[PDB]
Design an enzyme around this catalytic site. Sequence first.
Site, mmCIF file in Angstrom:
data_model
loop_
_atom_site.group_PDB
_atom_site.id
_atom_site.type_symbol
_atom_site.label_atom_id
_atom_site.label_comp_id
_atom_site.label_asym_id
_atom_site.label_seq_id
_atom_site.Cartn_x
_atom_site.Cartn_y
_atom_site.Cartn_z
ATOM 1 N N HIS A 41 37.262 56.239 42.484
ATOM 2 C CA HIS A 41 37.306 56.215 41.027
ATOM 3 C C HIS A 41 35.949 55.908 40.394
ATOM 4 C CE1 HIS A 41 38.508 51.840 41.363
ATOM 5 N NE2 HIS A 41 37.645 51.741 40.353
ATOM 6 N N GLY A 143 34.647 45.457 37.501
ATOM 7 C CA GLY A 143 33.434 45.488 38.302
ATOM 8 C C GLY A 143 33.629 45.078 39.758
ATOM 9 N N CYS A 145 35.782 46.271 41.871
ATOM 10 C CA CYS A 145 36.214 47.379 42.722
ATOM 11 C C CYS A 145 35.168 47.713 43.763
ATOM 12 C CB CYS A 145 36.620 48.598 41.904
ATOM 13 S SG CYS A 145 37.849 48.242 40.625
HETATM 14 C C1 LIG Z 1 40.329 45.602 35.380
HETATM 15 C C2 LIG Z 1 40.386 45.233 36.840
HETATM 16 C C3 LIG Z 1 40.591 43.911 37.221
HETATM 17 N N1 LIG Z 1 40.700 43.536 38.491
HETATM 18 N N2 LIG Z 1 40.605 44.473 39.482
HETATM 19 C C4 LIG Z 1 40.403 45.741 39.166
HETATM 20 C C5 LIG Z 1 40.274 46.201 37.858
HETATM 21 N N3 LIG Z 1 40.024 47.556 37.524
HETATM 22 C C6 LIG Z 1 40.887 48.586 37.649
HETATM 23 O O1 LIG Z 1 42.036 48.463 38.066
HETATM 24 C C7 LIG Z 1 40.334 49.935 37.228
HETATM 25 C C8 LIG Z 1 41.275 51.046 37.644
HETATM 26 C C9 LIG Z 1 42.197 51.571 36.748
HETATM 27 C C10 LIG Z 1 43.172 52.461 37.171
HETATM 28 C C11 LIG Z 1 43.234 52.849 38.503
HETATM 29 C C12 LIG Z 1 42.281 52.369 39.376
HETATM 30 CL CL1 LIG Z 1 42.246 52.966 41.016
HETATM 31 C C13 LIG Z 1 41.309 51.472 38.970
#
Ligand SMILES: Cc1cnncc1NC(=O)Cc1cccc(Cl)c1
Lengths: 304, 304
Positions: A41, A143, A145
């Site tokens: 992503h 951030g 990820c």
């Molecule tokens: C905001 C956040 C907080 N903690 N962990 C990850 C976060 N980011 C996401 O989940 C972004 C995202 C949205 C939809 C799908 C995917 Cl694969 C990824």
Amino acid sequence: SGFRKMAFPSGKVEGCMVQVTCGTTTLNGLWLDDVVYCPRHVICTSEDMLNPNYEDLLIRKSNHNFLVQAGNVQLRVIGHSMQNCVLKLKVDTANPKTPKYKFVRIQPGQTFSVLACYNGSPSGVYQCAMRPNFTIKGSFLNGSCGSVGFNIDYDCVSFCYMHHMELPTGVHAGTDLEGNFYGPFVDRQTAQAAGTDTTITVNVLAWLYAAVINGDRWFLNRFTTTLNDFNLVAMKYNYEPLTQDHVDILGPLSAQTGIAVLDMCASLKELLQNGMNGRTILGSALLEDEFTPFDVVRQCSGVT
Amino acid sequence: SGFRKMAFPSGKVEGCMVQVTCGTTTLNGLWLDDVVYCPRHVICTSEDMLNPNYEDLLIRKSNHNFLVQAGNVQLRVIGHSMQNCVLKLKVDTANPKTPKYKFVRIQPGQTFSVLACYNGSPSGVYQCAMRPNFTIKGSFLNGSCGSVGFNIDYDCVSFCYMHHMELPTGVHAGTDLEGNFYGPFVDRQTAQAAGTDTTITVNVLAWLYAAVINGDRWFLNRFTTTLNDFNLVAMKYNYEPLTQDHVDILGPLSAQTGIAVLDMCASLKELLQNGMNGRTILGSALLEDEFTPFDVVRQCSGVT
Ligand SMILES: Cc1cnncc1NC(=O)Cc1cccc(Cl)c1
Ligand SMILES: Cc1cnncc1NC(=O)Cc1cccc(Cl)c1
């Protein structure tokens, strides 16, 4: 003596962390040998995330669009490929800090340390369990990820998890290092059901053995039970049914303390049916399930 | 979202860990620049530990009696000196992996990460608090002496603790990196009283703010209190009396959530007087005191 939710020393994993930017999205990458692994992503924008066509999105990207930064050095991307939900960016330089490593898919109920990172920088390390429903209850922000979960056997890092997303319920989901999600999850901004979770019975019993080893003994009773009677109580309390395989892996702990596994099960049965009565076990007022029998052996004996 | 007892990434500290042997006693050393720091009891035998005369014991030791091993390399000892309860072994080689570092004496109620080591090897990392009575509830076995506690501000490691001993009660005691014990403790195999401990009020309030930020809100009530009324409840429940200094450091958390500090104090008062009613807060069934207001800000905002 003393029992702590201990994480692996994160040093070998910190040397692997890089920042990966594609367009205007930044996240964490894992640099091992001449390859950088990151969630796919990284190629999406906010509007793309609602229903992304990753193959289409990736076609508009070239090697030069992936910015990979190892702190102060910029890596040169000579190839890119998508494998399941991960991107593999071939770089022209092998990471000098690459430790001996393996990619492993862990089982539900197993534990690992997470090195939370932001913009390729390590922020902290904590120990967690992969829930029976394939989620993790981590601590992740925007951030994070691409931060990874791992275990270490002497000089070998077994990478088991890469963080991809936060579910609407605040729980976390990710993949193994081949980009296959743990659980039914898909990398899309959609509400997704996580299955019914259970408490990891074998780990709670391992944790009860750790409490005995360290002096917390008030929960030990004059009773015993059978696997079948115990499993009726585990059913009522949403605990994983105990099997002979679980009883076999609790063997070293049963042997060291001299408390038979079904006798320990009887203590757990009374704890489930009567609660803690305002008392604590290893500083906890609930039944802890994030220590596997292996983790208890390692900590209780001092393995490095 | 999510809240975890997160430890600092231990990488910069792992590169500093060495094994120190003197006679037949082995423990951990901390190699910074051209100096190795370790507990002074490395010079004792079991019989010496009952009432050691460290100055006399050290006089029978020469530079060549201190064996310092950095994994596979042997360091050459060119000087030795005792400072309080630590030994400083001057080596002829500056540690190439020395990070930017400071020696700091922490305050009771402050938190730090511990890198538990055995024979100079890192086994695990965990976050802990220095109890108001100057002990730590760690996880330490024979051989862990010389493992260190630290904090990290960007690229600077602030070493605050070196492990020396386990009290008859299973709690731990150690020194700052100048060898001064935290607490009344002495490095002798004698029963030693640790003072009456209290719960770190300011940290519990910071942890309540972390729970609000992450969604656990059931404990918030329609009440308020004063510092004087709250401190009467803190007295009854063996909590540290809350001061305006504590109220000032909770300011960023009060500002972000919009819940005034005395309103949060009123939630804590009701939790102390009525318990958790079989409920949890951030996965805990008790009031957590190992997160300082600073730790909550850092984790909740994602500082690396
Ligand atoms: C905001 C956040 C907080 N903690 N962990 C990850 C976060 N980011 C996401 O989940 C972004 C995202 C949205 C939809 C799908 C995917 Cl694969 C990824
Ligand atoms: C056995 C053990 C376990 N956990 N941590 C430290 C341990 N070792 C000791 O306490 C050895 C020792 C005895 C008397 C005084 C001192 Cl300064 C040190």
